[PDB]
Write a protein that binds this ligand. Structure first.
Ligand SMILES: CC(C)(COP(=O)(O)OP(=O)(O)OC[C@H]1O[C@@H](n2cnc3c(N)ncnc32)[C@H](O)[C@@H]1OP(=O)(O)O)[C@@H](O)C(=O)NCCC(=O)NCCS
Ligand SMILES: CC(C)(COP(=O)(O)OP(=O)(O)OC[C@H]1O[C@@H](n2cnc3c(N)ncnc32)[C@H](O)[C@@H]1OP(=O)(O)O)[C@@H](O)C(=O)NCCC(=O)NCCS
Ligand SMILES: [Cl-]
Ligand SMILES: [Cl-]
Ligand SMILES: [Cl-]
Ligand SMILES: [Cl-]
Lengths: 504, 512
């Protein structure tokens, strides 16, 4: 079953090594790939090998790598090992690339995922020399069918001077038809178009990405799997978090502040948000609808149990066993999933209009409910902000989820002051840990503190937090958001110095 | 001429004092008022008097005060002096109210101005007992014509149990027609409506606020002026900032990254703004368009010259001289201005669609370009975040402007780490001080730092900043966003302890 159904384009098929030779040192390369789904694989490997060879000969050979979101070991992993990426945007989860970033060997900036397409069109990343995009198939009309994610692929195809397509036989042919690619101006030159989405399950586009065939310089036939980590089966900590939130939603419904079927759900990357979805798959809320950035195992379970009717997202983020599950049951799931451009799925105008409920994980929050999603001790990148800002600020309800402690209790997830801020107080209304739920709506900072400390803090750390806060109220420069600047960041320094936030 | 053209409502006219008696201890009160414009005046004054009298007899008397944005002396000032506000939102510029907030005598939360209506409808502030709105006139069918701002007035009218109107004859009658009020679902229950604004000069609604006449409990005839602030005449610092920004606009135009008429302009509230508006007034760019929260003296002038074709905002932000140059020629300016609900003028979907250029002031930024707009030393409130968040994140271009120092040079506006964050790195692309302009587009945090330090920081503080950065690069826990947590906030603590961020030479400092 020929995947390249356009006859004329078959003449552009060539090996990965030859194709990679189109990528020059200094090139800006835009690729498909979103949370371990749909990134190119074979051309990156071939590139990485040639990069290492060139480095030994003393030839500079690095690229700027712009993606949808995070990719996999074949892309981020291989290129980082080869020391071949001088700039990376906007999101990564590969350990080797992360090490490059945190060692200052690769420059990194995690843009709001929903803005990357627009900033690319604006020229923020420079001119795109190459778009490297993985496809399920190429239609007779020359349409490019995406794989397990859409990401920024349409925008990258538009901008790039040259186009390389990887047609991956591994990807299920029945992916064709699952995507919704819109013809309108979302992230182009102002004035942009109104995106006529008024329901999360509404399609407004077509099944294929469009590209001038004259720009396609090479097509590489591939056969290699998406690779992403499994999710942690929800333990007692995660299940407690799920329990608190579901109870919360329940009361909201009883008070008629939410409909019985809630509102369109966004669930972010990570184990905790996934654990919540596992809770929802057997919860008291029916006819649920997903308007998310990614579909993780838990959301897939919800569609399976029937609690969720349909899920909109830009990408899959499935475990190896979940991915294998959906590709055996593509018949069932295909009619319940819509994969959109990432600048549509994370469009603020749409998110607010739909009234999405945002559920996201976090590194830490301070007592006033400022949120760190990214930088441990304020300097060491974990993954990136992703679309968490897109959704948190635009949502009807912004909810953040975390164990109250980290690293076996040696770190408190509730701190005097966040070492880095991704989400300001105004962007966070609800906090949930295994200790309880803090509802911050309508509260001043001092009021937010009392709630967060009492409800969410771990018993090991709560008195220390209360000690900080009470002395801050006595001594702070101002009393609106009381701080003791001499010790605001001292818990983080203590961890650095001793390996634990707990004093001796 | 009679301002109340609806006969039936005329019998609800009563004195300010009588009207104020409707407001009871513990009430949530929603009022009109936005950047010194269109706030109620006489009822709050009477309310404050009765509050003080109660307090003098050991009787509690306080309200929750929710507004459009900042008000004026007759409202925030009077009530703060009376200590009659237990909770305040979302924005304040009154000195007395600011003292109450910073002493913890008034609880305060500065929501995004564009989100306030929605959060009120959600019930975040509780049940609204009273709506108190200033009006230019009341039409034949009972429509309420706003005055010099729209703010959240329509939402407050919908929510409140009882309504009080102040009909202010100081406000020019020809304000009627300048407002655009939508009956569509902007900030109500999901699913909300598409707000179909695709041009900055587009009207989608009507000229009046709508309210059930049965809820109007009192109408007060008033005659009192809006009270804002004198003209902030641009100093050499502000002029320098304006100069650098205009050079930047010029360059973007020549590289075809902006059209010759630029894009719809949002100008923040502040003194640096006028310098920029003055600059645009004499600049090379024609057919300018305003899509902002406020309309300042500078915008008025460009509208007058035809330099700017239209200005959309939620409110006036004028000097007293500007307040009546426009009330002499309201006839003229009413055709050049559209005043919208603030949840429309600060709507993210619309701001992004129109591709607005956002220009806002700041307290400080750290070397990595995270921005503080609100809390001095991290704990003391200035004004509030306002709509700066609405615009900065949604804009086509996000620009922040500030003197490179504060308090006669004793504070650096560029610091190792911001004491508080309102706008994260991702929400800020351009920084401008009197020292220069930093273009941060496409840069990593370390790259952002090299630009901000070399272009924007004051020469008095640059070697200190470079020293912190250099040693952070060597020693930071991670090297992606290098920090020394031992001294990240030490400059702020230095100011608290000694009144200056500059170190003494009686002790060692690495940059020496
Ligand atoms: C913040 C985030 C890392 C949390 O992940 P999670 O899987 O729910 O939470 P976990 O408790 O399993 O923690 C994951 C990792 O973060 C670390 N971590 C979490 N909180 C921490 C803290 N306070 N201090 C230090 N490390 C912390 C854990 O140790 C773990 O790292 P490790 O496996 O190397 O030991 C993740 O949600 C994220 O990257 N968010 C940003 C993107 C986003 O939210 N996008 C939303 C739209 S799709
Ligand atoms: C941040 C803000 C206060 C700056 O105002 P501005 O007029 O450009 O700037 P100025 O340099 O005149 O300073 C304003 C005040 O802040 C103080 N200030 C500014 N930077 C400071 C700093 N780094 N440290 C301490 N104080 C500082 C000034 O001393 C002055 O205070 P003062 O009245 O006690 O003397 C103002 O823009 C603001 O409140 N912004 C938030 C609202 C907003 O942006 N809304 C969206 C647009 S409608
Ligand atoms: Cl839209
Ligand atoms: Cl709130
Ligand atoms: Cl809209
Ligand atoms: Cl950028």
């Amino acid at each position: 079953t020929e995947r390249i159904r356009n006859v004329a384009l078959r003449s552009k098929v060539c090996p990965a090594e030859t194709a990679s030779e189109l990528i020059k040192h200094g090139d800006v390369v835009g690729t498909s790939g979103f949370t371990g789904a749909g990134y190119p694989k074979e051309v990156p490997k071939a590139l990485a090998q040639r990069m290492e060879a060139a480095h030994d000969r003393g030839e500079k050979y690095q690229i700027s790598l712009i993606t949808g979101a995070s990719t996999g070991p074949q892309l981020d992993g291989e290129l980082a090992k080869a020391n071949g990426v001088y700039f990376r945007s906007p999101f990564n989860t590969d350990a080797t690339m992360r090490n490059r970033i945190n060692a200052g060997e690769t420059e990194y900036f995690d843009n709001h995922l929903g803005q990357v397409a627009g900033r690319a069109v604006q020229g923020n990343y420079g001119k795109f020399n190459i778009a490297l995009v993985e496809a399920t198939a190429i239609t007779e009309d020359g349409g490019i069918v995406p794989t397990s994610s859409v990401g920024n692929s349409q925008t990258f195809l538009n901008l790039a001077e040259k186009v390389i397509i990887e047609v991956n036989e591994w990807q299920n042919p029945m992916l064709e038809g699952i995507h919704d690619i819109w013809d309108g101006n979302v992230s182009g030159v102002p004035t942009r178009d109104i995106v006529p989405i008024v329901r999360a399950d509404q399609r407004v586009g077509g099944p294929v990405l469009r590209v001038n065939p004259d720009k396609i310089a090479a097509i590489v036939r591939t056969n290699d799997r998406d690779r992403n980590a499994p999710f942690a089966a929800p333990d007692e900590t995660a299940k407690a978090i799920a329990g608190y939130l579901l109870d919360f939603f329940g009361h909201e419904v009883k008070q008629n502040r939410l409909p019985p079927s809630l509102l369109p759900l966004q669930s972010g990357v990570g184990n905790v948000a996934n654990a919540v979805l596992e809770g929802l798959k057997e919860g008291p809320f029916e006819n649920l609808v997903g308007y998310s950035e990614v579909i993780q195992d838990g959301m897939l379970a919800m569609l399976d149990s029937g609690r969720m009717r349909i899920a909109s997202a830009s990408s899959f983020s499935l475990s190896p066993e979940a991915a294998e599950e959906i590709n055996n049951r593509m018949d069932f799931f295909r009619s319940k999933i819509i994969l959109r451009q990432q600048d549509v799925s994370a469009s603020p105008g749409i998110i607010r209009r739909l009234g999405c409920i945002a559920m996201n994980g976090m590194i830490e929050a301070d007592i006033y409910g400022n949120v760190n999603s990214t930088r441990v001790m304020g300097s060491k990148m974990m993954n990136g902000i992703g679309g968490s800002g897109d959704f948190a600020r635009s949502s009807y309800l912004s909810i953040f989820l975390s164990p109250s402690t980290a690293k076996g209790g040696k770190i408190s997830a509730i701190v005097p002051m966040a070492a880095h801020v991704d989400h300001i107080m105004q962007d966070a209304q609800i906090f949930v840990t295994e200790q309880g739920l803090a509802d911050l709506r309508g509260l001043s900072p001092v009021q937010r503190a009392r709630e967060i400390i009492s409800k969410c803090a771990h018993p090991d750390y709560r008195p220390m937090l209360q000690d900080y806060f009470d002395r801050a109220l006595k001594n702070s420069f101002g009393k609106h958001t009381p701080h003791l600047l001499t010790e605001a960041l001292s818990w983080h320094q203590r961890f650095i110095d001793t390996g634990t936030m707990l004093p001796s």
